[PDB]
Design a protein around this ligand. Structure first.
Ligand SMILES: NCCCNCCCCCS
Ligand SMILES: NCCCNCCCCCS
Ligand SMILES: [K+]
Ligand SMILES: [K+]
Ligand SMILES: [K+]
Ligand SMILES: [K+]
Ligand SMILES: [Mg+2]
Ligand SMILES: [Mg+2]
Ligand SMILES: [Zn+2]
Ligand SMILES: [Zn+2]
Lengths: 346, 347
């Protein structure tokens, strides 16, 4: 069996929010620190490969994807919120409704709404530090692969694939997969593919590269007619301008099992083959699991070994970025199964 | 003796009685509470302002002259769909059409909730549909009273309406009562209508509804949206579009603005109404301009509302007043009724 290195930062635990808006109530958040700790423990248990901490790349590579005003806002948001006298965690209350102007206001409540797409992603002390560490985790995995590793596992937390150039949400702040893909491009890789196997549509990644033909973006996901993110992810979204034909969405209905999901995976792999990229980023979520509380697919733990094996057969330099997966008990087995299948297990 | 003004009030407003409002990251007791309407009604009775009438039922026809059919359907079914989907809190949006996403109506109730909203502070629960319907009938009954010969009528609406677009709810508003009354004037043959929004917040819904039209002049005085709700409309450069260019007027004020400066804006609005020469006037009346209001930063005094009502009467127009905001429940009755009493000649 092969080996794969994992990048992990203990600084993820700086993000430890207490509240998530869900069904009209404030609940304990789904995207909790134990997710990364459970995955880490399985990486060690299975001796997957070397575990390393990230290097500090600074904001340069983050700002190749995200706007400067957005990066500034994420660093100051919590200070601005506390200073304005709010007593809860930072949660948007108002946003740019249909018919309103996409215009950045001065007030923190208006700024919060301008930069968000949902109210379930509370911001509090340590969110900036954790988001910075997570992007460095992704950049460190990309450096490992650029320097010669076939693949590397970026154990990111918070996840990234829902963040736009200048919008946070879906538990995401910096788009780690897009940051890694752009780093490949800046280092001379002519074409990069990003494949999103998380249950939810990678709307941030789609938006970031939507008018570009040098980065192919593909996502398999639950039908947004029915699930988050609702307002992107449909199969008719194929790109715009030079990017037309360089975005591919593959949608599935409730209770979809691996036997059908893997048919979409095969279509994605055929699209990657014709694109013929120089590097692959896989935005990996295991909320496709049959026990996941906020998804409706029916993948089993053994199916992740099959997924990893199929991804290896693409024969590409591959960075895996950790996205979702919210049955905390099974998240380690399921995520590491993808890496182990990539390395030849089962 | 003062003149008399009839008030329309529906006991059905108390069907809207939500338990939660998102505020500052917490779920708090809602500001827009039933005691607001009961405190105003009590003052109307105590001051013997005039006859108090219950509304007539107009149906959804006049509502759909302003609001889209799909939005009206959504508001009727939202609570039933929410409960059927197994949610345990009140109906509050969690996700919406972010910048860069598609304005596309989805099937799921969370998606529809976000599609049709501009904020998460406006919980929906059982009775919200019924209360919003009755509130629109209150505005239409006041409009009918004026069209049948009354100089003015006070529509004691709850919930308020001026933040609702043709197909967006928010800011405690569901049906835009002021816009519905204005459109009723137009449909009845009044050639030109002015809607004057003196609530502390921008009447963004009213502006949006009539934004490409010149037959309805919309004017709002309000706190600077750089600083306060609704944040993304209400700026002075928003003057209308298409055939409505120059028929929307936003007058913006900064924190701590007193009546001595606010009334300069009111004179500007009155001059714009004069040149427009409308056949009827709807006043979207909020008294959250009051110095003690917790949701606002202007400094009007109770006596200033007498002056406001007097000045509005001097426009010489058939006038419907629709109740909007005002959240210091203690003085909301004095302040709102002072506008009507000042209009009828009090001090
Ligand atoms: N309380 C809202 C639950 C849904 N949250 C959005 C889905 C996030 C997927 C992240 S991979
Ligand atoms: N919890 C948010 C408080 C702000 N709510 C918007 C202001 C509504 C006044 C409209 S008349
Ligand atoms: K996906
Ligand atoms: K693309
Ligand atoms: K106003
Ligand atoms: K207009
Ligand atoms: Mg504010
Ligand atoms: Mg849903
Ligand atoms: Zn997910
Ligand atoms: Zn108001």
């Amino acid at each position: 069996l092969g080996s794969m290195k994992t990048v992990f930062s203990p600084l993820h635990s700086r993000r430890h929010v207490k509240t998530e808006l869900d069904g009209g109530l404030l609940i304990e958040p789904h995207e909790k620190p134990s997710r990364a700790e459970t995955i880490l423990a399985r990486v060690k248990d299975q001796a997957l490969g070397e575990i390393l901490e990230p290097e500090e790349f600074g904001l340069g590579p983050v700002k190749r994807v995200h706007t400067a005003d957005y990066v500034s806002f994420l660093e100051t948001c919590w200070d601005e919120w506390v200073a304005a006298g709010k007593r809860g965690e930072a949660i948007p209350t108002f946003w740019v409704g249909r018919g309103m102007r996409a215009r950045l206001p001065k007030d923190i409540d208006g700024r919060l709404g301008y930069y968000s797409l949902g109210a379930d992603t509370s911001i509090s002390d340590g969110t900036w530090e954790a988001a910075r560490a997570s992007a460095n985790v992704a950049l460190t995995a990309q450096k490992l692969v650029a320097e010669g590793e076939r693949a590397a596992f970026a154990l990111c937390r918070p996840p990234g694939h829902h963040a736009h150039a200048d919008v946070f949400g879906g538990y995401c702040f910096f788009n780690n997969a897009a940051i890694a893909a752009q780093a490949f491009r800046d280092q001379g890789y002519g074409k990069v593919a990003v494949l999103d196997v998380d249950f939810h549509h990678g709307n941030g990644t789609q938006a970031i590269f939507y008018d570009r033909s040098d980065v192919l973006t593909i996502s398999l996901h639950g039908d947004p007619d029915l699930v988050f993110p609702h307002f992107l992810g449909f199969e008719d979204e194929t790109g715009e301008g030079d990017g037309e034909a360089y975005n591919l969405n593959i949608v599935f209905p409730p209770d979809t099992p691996f036997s059908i999901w893997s048919q979409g995976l095969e279509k994605a792999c055929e699209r990657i083959r014709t694109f013929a990229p120089d590097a692959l980023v896989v935005a990996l979520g295991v909320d496709t699991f049959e026990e996941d509380p906020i998804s409706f697919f029916k993948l089993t733990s053994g199916d992740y070994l099959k997924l990893g094996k199929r991804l290896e057969q693409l024969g590409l330099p591959t960075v895996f970025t950790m996205e979702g997966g919210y049955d905390v008990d099974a998240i380690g087995v399921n995520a590491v199964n993808v890496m182990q299948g990539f390395e030849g297990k089962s």
